[PDB]
Amino acid sequence: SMPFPKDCSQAMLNGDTTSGLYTIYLNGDKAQALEVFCDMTSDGGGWIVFLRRKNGRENFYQNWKAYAAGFGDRREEFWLGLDNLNKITAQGQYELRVDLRDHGETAFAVYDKFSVGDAKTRYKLKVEGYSGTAGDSMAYHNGRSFSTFDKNCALSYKGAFWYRNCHRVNLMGRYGDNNHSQGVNWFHWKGHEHSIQFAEMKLRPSNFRNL
Numbered sequence: 001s002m003p004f005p006k007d008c009s010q011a012m013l014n015g016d017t018t019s020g021l022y023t024i025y026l027n028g029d030k031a032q033a034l035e036v037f038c039d040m041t042s043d044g045g046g047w048i049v050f051l052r053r054k055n056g057r058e059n060f061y062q063n064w065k066a067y068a069a070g071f072g073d074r075r076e077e078f079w080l081g082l083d084n085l086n087k088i089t090a091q092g093q094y095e096l097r098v099d100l101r102d103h104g105e106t107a108f109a110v111y112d113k114f115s116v117g118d119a120k121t122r123y124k125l126k127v128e129g130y131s132g133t134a135g136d137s138m139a140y141h142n143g144r145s146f147s148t149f150d151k152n153c154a155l156s157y158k159g160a161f162w163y164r165n166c167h168r169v170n171l172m173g174r175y176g177d178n179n180h181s182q183g184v185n186w187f188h189w190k191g192h193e194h195s196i197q198f199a200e201m202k203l204r205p206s207n208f209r210n211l
Contacts, residue, residue: 004028006091007169008038009046009204009211017045021074024048026087034084036076041203042099043110046087047202050080053184054198056175061158064151069117079172081148082116082123088203089115095206096127098171099187100134107134107189112206122146125162135188137168155185157182171199 003015004025008184011022019040026032052062052163058077072078087093096114100107112129130136146160149155153163159173168187177183177194183195190196206209 004030005098005203007046007088007094008040008048009033011038012040012046016040019045019151022180026084026089028051035074036080037078038202041150042097042202046204047097047206048080048204049074049202050085051171052077053175053196053199055202056182060160061154061174062148063146067146067148067160068123070148071175072207077092077206083119085116085203086118086123095129095208096138096203098132098134098138098186098202099198099200099202100196102187102190102194103197107186108132109136109138109186111138112205121164122151134186137186137188140168142165171196 002010005011006028007024013118017040019059021035022038023033024036026034037049039049052100058072068082070079070081087172094114096111098109109132115126124145125141127138127142141162141164144164147163148160153166154160157173159170161167161170161172164208170185173183178193178195181192185192
């Protein structure tokens with residue numbers, strides 16, 4: 001086992017194959033512990049989950065400081081925090097996976113390269129290298145800074161995202177809201193008038209697949 005694993009791939013390689021809560025250590029530094037939910041089962045496991053939608057119990061219409069820091073219950077609905085995502089994606093080359101489920105149907109999207117910039121970039125999104133079945137709805141958002149109501153698409157739709165004008169992905173939107181563009185949307189799978197019941201975003205090293 002590795003003593004201060006820096007992501008869920010190094011915690012899974014430590015022999016922990018059950019999904020749940022794990023401690024990771026940013027930059028492998030024992031003074032930078034972060035509790036994360038690891039998905040150890042999807043496509044070989046080793047994923048840090050950073051967004052979960054599943055029941056509408058948590059409020060995702062939150063401000064900049066909340067999106068920077070993280071909020072929620074990591075075993076249920078939560079957002080890991082943009083500062084954490086920047087620090088994790090700075091450790092090496094990471095891939096993004098999105099898992100979606102709605103009324104028994106499932107879809108996914110993977111991006112071979114995924115990073116989140118620092119606060120001076122307003123947590124700029126980078127995604128490249130799509131594969132999947134949900135449709136490449138993140139391409140529209142590539143390169144964009146993050147936006148909240150207090151830093152307007154986030155106000156108009158009462159969510160938060162790397163908005164453009166405004167979105168094809170809205171996974172921090174209003175739970176269960178099928179009004180156009182208001183809900184948990186992945187446009188190229190279910191459009192703008194269907195809020196998705198279950199969604200997770202997660203990341204792991206891109207070289208995991210053959211490490």
